[PDB]
A paper describes a structure:
Filoviruses are unusual among mononegaviruses in that they encode an additional nucleocapsid component, VP30. VP30 is a multifunctional protein and acts as a transcriptional activator.
The EBOV NP-VP30 fusion protein diffracted to 2.20 Å with ten protomers in the asymmetric unit, while the MARV NP-VP30 construct diffracted to 3.25 Å with eight protomers in the asymmetric unit. All of the EBOV NP peptides bind to VP30 in an identical fashion. Very few NP side chains make hydrogen bonds to VP30. The NP peptide makes several hydrogen bonds using its main-chain atoms to the VP30 side chains of Q203, R213, Q229 and W230. The buried non-polar surface area calculated from the ITC experiments is 520 Å2, which is similar to the 620 Å2 of total buried surface area observed in the EBOV NP-VP30 crystal structure.
Author numbering:
A (entry chain B): 114 to 123, 140 to 265
B (entry chain A): 113 to 125, 140 to 265
Write the structure that this text describes.
Amino acid sequence: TVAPPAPVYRPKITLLTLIKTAEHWARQDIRTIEDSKLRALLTLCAVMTRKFSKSQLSLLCETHLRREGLGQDQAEPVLEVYQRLHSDKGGSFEAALWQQWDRQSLIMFITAFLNIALQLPCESSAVVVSGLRTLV
Amino acid sequence: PTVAPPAPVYRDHPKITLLTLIKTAEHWARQDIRTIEDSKLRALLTLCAVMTRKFSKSQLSLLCETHLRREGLGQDQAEPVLEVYQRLHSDKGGSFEAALWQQWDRQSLIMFITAFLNIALQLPCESSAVVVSGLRTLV
């Protein structure tokens, strides 16, 4: 790999605002909220899923199952949602989820995600985690 | 046509979190890293690469331009700056990140890392008007 030459010297939705929004909504009862707020929460989950490394999605899936009491047979559909939100372009998969899932299924999934996302590490790589150790 | 998987079937009824990453960046943005040890500088390069990936691909242009403005760099310097951000954002197994460490001089790495840490926490991590308008009602 060849690096480029070094430089020659002659409401903002920031990472923190995203976390704060998730913390607030993880604490709320969204079972009765309006469709417009629920649609926005789906976007929040899609954006936040993309703040997890691709390799961390397996643990995210498994933590989701454990919190919800879901069986191991339910792992692939849950992992598929996370993987396809993570690789989503122009909200294509996110819109398919909104259109094809029942409201109750989306509320269950969004609540489970919001209540696990802030406690899980956003990186799974042993090299990244060991690399960052000296800085924390 | 995009087909979503079936919904889950209910039969009955220091960790590197995103907040830790932000707190680590906040702390190191305030430090003078001109004299720190190589092991801490190497770790800061990993912190920059990991954070870069917390920005959407489309937000990289604004990140590069904010970097150029803070540093007083000319517009002819935007492509190699954006190249760094684009290749850290798509990096696999730290391949591009290691090439930087190996090929750039210590001064260049210090300058780049300081500039990034001092701009990363103030920039939105999303550029899409659809995403930003979608999230508006929730903030």
